[PDB]
């Protein structure tokens, strides 16, 4: 077939019921994740090819960057709660991987301050139980699927994208292949 299990995707041994339709995992410490965001704009191109009625979910993970990794998972929860993902994603990536100016929870906070979120508002969110359960959700979703690597995309809790089996000569061709594969899996 043109799309084959083990080729552009793999199938989960054990499928995850009630899963978000399109579930993406990343780490701000993850070098291919940086590319996926800054250079390839994967999430955005996937969404451009997804149908009516399809929600996209993106979660941070703990297993990279030790203590700061966990802080970043809590901060991503803050971003989701405030709806400011699109203002902090880029400066968080660059702060971790490019300028390496993010070394503590306070430095993460600075990125939000600089992005225009108010101190009171960030600190209140940071300590909120709404953010606590949002952290819980990120961890649970990753636990449900044996997540040992990022970037990762799961469709309907049963298919996992396999970008290793797509051509990487051309960046634009890779992205469309990736997005077309999500669409195909979505329709499956």
Question: Domain with 53 in it: what CATH number?
Answer: 3.40.30.10
Nearest to 65 by CA among 54, 55, 76: 76
Domain count, the chain: 1
**Which residues does residue 60 pair with via DSSP β-bridges, in sequence order?**
26
Specify the 3-state DSSP secondary structure of 102: coil
Say if CB 155 and CB 3 are below 8 A apart.
no
Supply the range of the domain harboring residue 10: 1-188
Burial 148-171 (b: 16+ CB within 10 A, else e): eebbbbbbbbbbbbbbeebeeeee
User: And the tokens for 64?
Assistant: 């990279």
Could you tell me the resolution of this structure in angstroms?
A: 1.9
Say if CB 74 and CB 112 are below 8 A apart.
no
Q: CB under 8 Å to 75, separation ≥6 — which residues?
A: 60, 88, 92, 105, 108, 109, 112, 126
């Amino acid at each position: 077939a043109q799309y084959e299990d083990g080729k552009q995707y793999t199938t989960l041994e054990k499928p995850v019921a009630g899963a978000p339709q399109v579930l993406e995992f990343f780490s701000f410490f993850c070098p291919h994740c940086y590319q996926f965001e800054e250079v390839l704009h994967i999430s955005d191109n996937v969404k451009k090819k997804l149908p009516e009625g399809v929600k996209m979910t993106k979660y941070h993970v703990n297993f990279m960057g030790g203590d700061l990794g966990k802080d970043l998972t809590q901060a991503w929860a803050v971003a989701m709660a405030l709806g400011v993902e699109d203002k902090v994603t880029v400066p968080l990536f660059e702060g971790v991987q490019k300028t390496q100016t993010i070394r503590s929870a306070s430095d993460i906070r600075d990125v939000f301050i600089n992005a225009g979120i108010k101190g009171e508002e960030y600190d209140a969110a940071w300590n909120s139980f709404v953010v606590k359960s949002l952290v819980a959700q990120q961890e649970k979703a990753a636990a449900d699927v044996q997540l040992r690597g990022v970037p990762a995309m799961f469709v309907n809790g049963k298919y996992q994208l396999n970008p290793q089996g797509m051509d990487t000569s051309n960046m634009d061709v890779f992205v469309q292949q990736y997005a077309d594969t999500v669409k195909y899996l979505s329709e499956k």
